[PDB]
C-alpha cells in the first residue's frame, strides 16, 4: 500500500490550495481517509477525516470552516480543499488510511507529505 | 429489518435521511416510531407515508424501491433521540435495530487516567483496575490492558456515559479485575488507549 | 386514552409471573393489545398479541410456548402469564394499543401501528439477592481524576454525590453493568484542578436504598 | 361479527377516487340498512354515511360533495364511490349492515373487517 499526497506549495494568506493523496494498493471506498499536519518541532497534528461516503466528515478546531475533505473513491483519491489560509496552517501535510472500517484511527499507511507554507 | 446508517452524526436544522432495508419480509410497509431515553416510544409515520395527528411537519415519508426512507428537512434542536422502522410479516411484527442520531461537534480525544485497586479491597482478595477515558468524541474508542506487557483478554467490563447534555461527550471505564493473587504476580499494569483522534495511543500505567 | 402496566418484581429464574395491563377510556372489545419488550441497552422486540376474544393470538419464538396471554374484557384487561423464567428475559415490558383486525388489513400499502404505549414495567430475573456496595477510592496519582468504586450491589439503583453535592461540576458516574456475579458494579469520577489535590478533600457519597446502605468514602491522594 | 366482505381499497394519489364495495357472504335477501365507518389511526370510530330501506343517503358533515353511497338491490351490495380524494381520509373503513337472511326471520346485525385506504404522493 502506498499513499502519495500533493498540492502543497507557497500560499499567501487568505489564499487557497486543494491537497491530494492518492492511494494504490488499496481500495479507499472502504476506509475513512484522514489529513494531518506537522510544523516542525511539533506533533503531528489531526487535520480532518472523510469517512466512507455517507458517514461524514470531522475536523480539527484549527480548520473548521475553512477546509473541507472530499473524496473520489472511484480514482482511491482524497482531497483536502484548503481556503483562507493563516500562517498558522503552514505545515508537512499528510494522508493516512484508517485501516479499521469501524473508524477507531488504526492508521496503519502513511503518505510521505507535501508541504504547505502560507506566507506573503 | 437492517437500518443502514447507524450512528448518523448531526448539526441543527439541517436535512438528514435514514433508511430501512427491507429485509425482503413481505414487504407490507414501514411505519416509523421515536423513542428518547427511558421513555415511551412515539408513533411517528404509519403506513410509511402519512403522518399521525399533531405531529410537527418537518417530518416526511417515502417508498424509494423497495428501500423505505424517513427525511427529516430540518433538525430541531429537541429531535435527538434513537427511531425505530417496524415491518409486518406474515403473523408476527419485527422492530428494526434501529439509528440514533446525534449532535455534530467538532473530534475530541479522550484524557486517559489510571487507577491502582486500594489496599481495602485487595485485603478482601479482589483487584480492580480502573481505567478512565473522559470527555471524548465520536463514541468508539479501544482499551487494551497490558499486564506485564502481556494483552489480556476476558477480565474486563466497559461502561460508557451517554452523551453530555452540554458538551455532547462520552467517557468510559474500563475495569479489569483479578484475584488478589494473580494482581500480586506482577509488576506493570496499563492500559493503552486508541481513538480516532489520537495520533498514537495512549497509555498510562503503574508499577504495582 | 391511559394504558397503565402493572406487576413487575423480582423473579427467581424459571418462575413464573402475571402482567397486567389496566385498559381505560377506549371501546376495548376494539382494539388489540401488543406486549413489546426491551432489553437493557437494545432495540424494541415484539413478543405477543391478543385481541378482544381469545380466537386470536399469535406470539413470538423467543418465548414460543413458555408464555401465556389472556384477556378479560370484564375489566378491559389483559394478562401475561410467564413460566420458566430464563435470566436474559431481564427487560422492561410495555403495553401497546392497535387495530383488532391487525392481521386481515397488513399489506404492502399499509400498517397500522401502535398509537397508545403506556409506560412500563421492570420485571428482572435473577438468583440476585440484595446487597449494598463495597466502597472503594480511585486515588488521584493541569487536571486530575478521582473517583469512587461503587462495587457488587444489587438491585439497581445507587447514586453517588461528592462533598455532599457541593461538587458537581466534571462528576461522571458511569451507568451500572452487570458482572458474571449477577451484581452490579460502577465507578463515579470527577476531575478537578491538580493544584487542589494537597488542599481540598474529596468525599464521595454513596447511597444503595435497597440496602440501606449509606457510605462515605474519602478519596485521598 | 363475520361473513361480511367489503374489498376495493387502494393506494391512491391526492384527489383520485375509488369505489368501495361492501358485500355479503352467500345468498343474502336483503340489507335494509348500511352505513360506512372510519377508525384512523389515532381516533375514533367516526361514521362517514348511511343508506335506510328505502333511501336517505345521509353524510357526515365533512364529507358532503365527495362520497356517493348507493345500492344495488339486484346482488346485494352496498357501494360507496369516493371522489376527489384528500390526505385526511386515510383509514379503513369498515361496513356495518342489518342483514335478513330469509324473506320472514327476523332482522340481525353484521358487522365487516374493512379494508385500508392510502392517500399520498
Known amino acids: 500500500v502506498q499513499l502519495q499526497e500533493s498540492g502543497g506549495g507557497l500560499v499567501q494568506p487568505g489564499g487557497s490550495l486543494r491537497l491530494s493523496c492518492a492511494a494504490s494498493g488499496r481500495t479507499i471506498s472502504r476506509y475513512a481517509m484522514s489529513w494531518f499536519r506537522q510544523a516542525p518541532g511539533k506533533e503531528r497534528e489531526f487535520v480532518a477525516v472523510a469517512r466512507r461516503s455517507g458517514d461524514g466528515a470531522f475536523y480539527a478546531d484549527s480548520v473548521q470552516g475553512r477546509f473541507t475533505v472530499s473524496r473520489d473513491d472511484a480514482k482511491n483519491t482524497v482531497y483536502l480543499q484548503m481556503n483562507s489560509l493563516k500562517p498558522e496552517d503552514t505545515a508537512v501535510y499528510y494522508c493516512a488510511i484508517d485501516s479499521d472500517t469501524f473508524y477507531s484511527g488504526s492508521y496503519d499507511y502513511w503518505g510521505q507529505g507535501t508541504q504547505v507554507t502560507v506566507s506573503s | 429489518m437492517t437500518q443502514s446508517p447507524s450512528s448518523l452524526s448531526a448539526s441543527v436544522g439541517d436535512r438528514v435521511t435514514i433508511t430501512c432495508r427491507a429485509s425482503q419480509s413481505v414487504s407490507s410497509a414501514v411505519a416509523w416510531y421515536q423513542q428518547k431515553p427511558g421513555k415511551a416510544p412515539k408513533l411517528l409515520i404509519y403506513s410509511a407515508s402519512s403522518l399521525y395527528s399533531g405531529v410537527p411537519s418537518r417530518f416526511s415519508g417515502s417508498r424509494s424501491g423497495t428501500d423505505f426512507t424517513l427525511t427529516i428537512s430540518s433538525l430541531q434542536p429537541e429531535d435527538f433521540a434513537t427511531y425505530y422502522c417496524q415491518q409486518s410479516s406474515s403473523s408476527l411484527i419485527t422492530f428494526g435495530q434501529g439509528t440514533k442520531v446525534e449532535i455534530k461537534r467538532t473530534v475530541a480525544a479522550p484524557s486517559v487516567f489510571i487507577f491502582p485497586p486500594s489496599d481495602s479491597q485487595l485485603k478482601s482478595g479482589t483487584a480492580s483496575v480502573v481505567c478512565l477515558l473522559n470527555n471524548f468524541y465520536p463514541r468508539e474508542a479501544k482499551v487494551q490492558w497490558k499486564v506485564d506487557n502481556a494483552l489480556q483478554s476476558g477480565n474486563s467490563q466497559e461502561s460508557v456515559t451517554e452523551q453530555d447534555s452540554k458538551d455532547s461527550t462520552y467517557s468510559l471505564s474500563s475495569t479489569l479485575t483479578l484475584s488478589k493473587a494473580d494482581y500480586e504476580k506482577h509488576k506493570v499494569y496499563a492500559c493503552e488507549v486508541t481513538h480516532q483522534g489520537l495520533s498514537s495511543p495512549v497509555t498510562k500505567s503503574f508499577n504495582r | 386514552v391511559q394504558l397503565v402496566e402493572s406487576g413487575g418484581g423480582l423473579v427467581q429464574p424459571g418462575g413464573s409471573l402475571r402482567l397486567s395491563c389496566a385498559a381505560s377510556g377506549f371501546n376495548f372489545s376494539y382494539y388489540s393489545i401488543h406486549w413489546v419488550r426491551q432489553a437493557p441497552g437494545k432495540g424494541l422486540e415484539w413478543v405477543a398479541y391478543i385481541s378482544s376474544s381469545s380466537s386470536y393470538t399469535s406470539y413470538a419464538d423467543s418465548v414460543k410456548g413458555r408464555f401465556t396471554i389472556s384477556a378479560d374484557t370484564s375489566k378491559n384487561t389483559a394478562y401475561l402469564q410467564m413460566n420458566s423464567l430464563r435470566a436474559e428475559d431481564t427487560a422492561v415490558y410495555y403495553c401497546a394499543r392497535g387495530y383488532q383486525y391487525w392481521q386481515y388489513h397488513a399489506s404492502w400499502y399499509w400498517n397500522g401501528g401502535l398509537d397508545y404505549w403506556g409506560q412500563g414495567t421492570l420485571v428482572t430475573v435473577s438468583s440476585a439477592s440484595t446487597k449494598g456496595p463495597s466502597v472503594f477510592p480511585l486515588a488521584p496519582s493541569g487536571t486530575a481524576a478521582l473517583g469512587c468504586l461503587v462495587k457488587d450491589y444489587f438491585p439497581e439503583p445507587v447514586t453517588v454525590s461528592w462533598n455532599s453535592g457541593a461538587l458537581t461540576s466534571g462528576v461522571h458516574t458511569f451507568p451500572a453493568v452487570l458482572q458474571s456475579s449477577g451484581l452490579y458494579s460502577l465507578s463515579s469520577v470527577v476531575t478537578v484542578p491538580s493544584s487542589s489535590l494537597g488542599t481540598q478533600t474529596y468525599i464521595c457519597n454513596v447511597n444503595h436504598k435497597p440496602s440501606n446502605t449509606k457510605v462515605d468514602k474519602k478519596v485521598e491522594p | 361479527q363475520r361473513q361480511l366482505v367489503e374489498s376495493g381499497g387502494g393506494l391512491v394519489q391526492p384527489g383520485g377516487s375509488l369505489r368501495l364495495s361492501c358485500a355479503a357472504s352467500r345468498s343474502i335477501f336483503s340489507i335494509d340498512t348500511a352505513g360506512w365507518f372510519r377508525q384512523a389511526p389515532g381516533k375514533e370510530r367516526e361514521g362517514v354515511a348511511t343508506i335506510t330501506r328505502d333511501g336517505n343517503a345521509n353524510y357526515a358533515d365533512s364529507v358532503k360533495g365527495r362520497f356517493t353511497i348507493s345500492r344495488d338491490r339486484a346482488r346485494n351490495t352496498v357501494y360507496l364511490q369516493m371522489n376527489s380524494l384528500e390526505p385526511e381520509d386515510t383509514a379503513v373503513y369498515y361496513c356495518?349492515?342489518?342483514?335478513?337472511?330469509?324473506?320472514?326471520?327476523?332482522?340481525?346485525?353484521?358487522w365487516g373487517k374493512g379494508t385500508p385506504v392510502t392517500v399520498s404522493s
Open positions: 356495518n349492515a342489518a342483514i335478513r337472511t330469509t324473506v320472514r326471520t327476523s332482522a340481525q346485525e353484521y
